[PDB]
Design a protein around this ligand. Sequence first.
Ligand SMILES: Fc1ccc(-c2ncn(C3CCCCC3)c2-c2ccnc3[nH]ccc23)cc1
Length: 289
Amino acid sequence: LRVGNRYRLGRKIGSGDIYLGTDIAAGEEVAIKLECVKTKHPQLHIESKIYKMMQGGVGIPTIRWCGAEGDYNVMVMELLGPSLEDLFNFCSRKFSLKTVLLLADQMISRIEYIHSKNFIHRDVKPDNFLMGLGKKGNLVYIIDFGLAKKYRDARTHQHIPYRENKNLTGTARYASINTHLGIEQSRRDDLESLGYVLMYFNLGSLPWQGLKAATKRQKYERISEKKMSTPIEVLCKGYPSEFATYLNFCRSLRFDDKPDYSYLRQLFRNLFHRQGFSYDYVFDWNMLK
Ligand SMILES: Fc1ccc(-c2ncn(C3CCCCC3)c2-c2ccnc3[nH]ccc23)cc1
């Protein structure tokens, strides 16, 4: 079907829904996200506004086209490759220290860029980072701005107020302690969540993963409690101290503190150099044959 002037829609990729497509005119594959014009909760146009504000940043996917066609609102992106969850599954849920550290360097940089554009992400998880294709295959991208919010006024740089008594909107596995306590999310929270993602890659799972409970809200209570009763030195036992030092620093941040991103990158860089690794972008999955 003839989306825009110059895009052919293909079959679904996964999860509105995501499709493979072709830029017929340029001879490139693309990713297409459709949303029905009458949902109860229209979101794509809002998301697209944010993706547009992010454009030009390293590892932000490039919008080809937004519009509407027939029954649908439409956004078209340059094609990207598999997520970190997909590549983690493909690697038997085991990443080397070198791979974790290569990813951590880029991942901190993307969150910092988002924050520079006056937003917080609030769904930092392996599924929302994708590797590029082709020439861009060494580059980690971030996606999914459906849960994102402005944390300061674009002009006045005025932080949003400290609020309580909130819901847990994102993914519970990687959520911050302050999020479980129902406190308003800020920059520190995106970074703490990254901290849990990194240990996830180290361990193959997290200790509060796979808790049975009867209801959903009961399951979140159980995750919260497990997190809050698992000291950082226990979570990180048997891995370089840097993972612990990073999570402790994140948990020390005040609501409206600007994180020292540079310090966090330097932490993992120094570890990287002590191990004698080279920044040559050869991830575990590149060595498959
Ligand atoms: F305009 C957009 C087009 C696609 C997407 C998207 N959402 C989710 N994904 C993937 C689907 C496969 C599982 C992992 C998440 C995409 C997506 C898929 C492929 N290459 C892409 N390039 C940019 C986003 C995206 C988001 C906005």
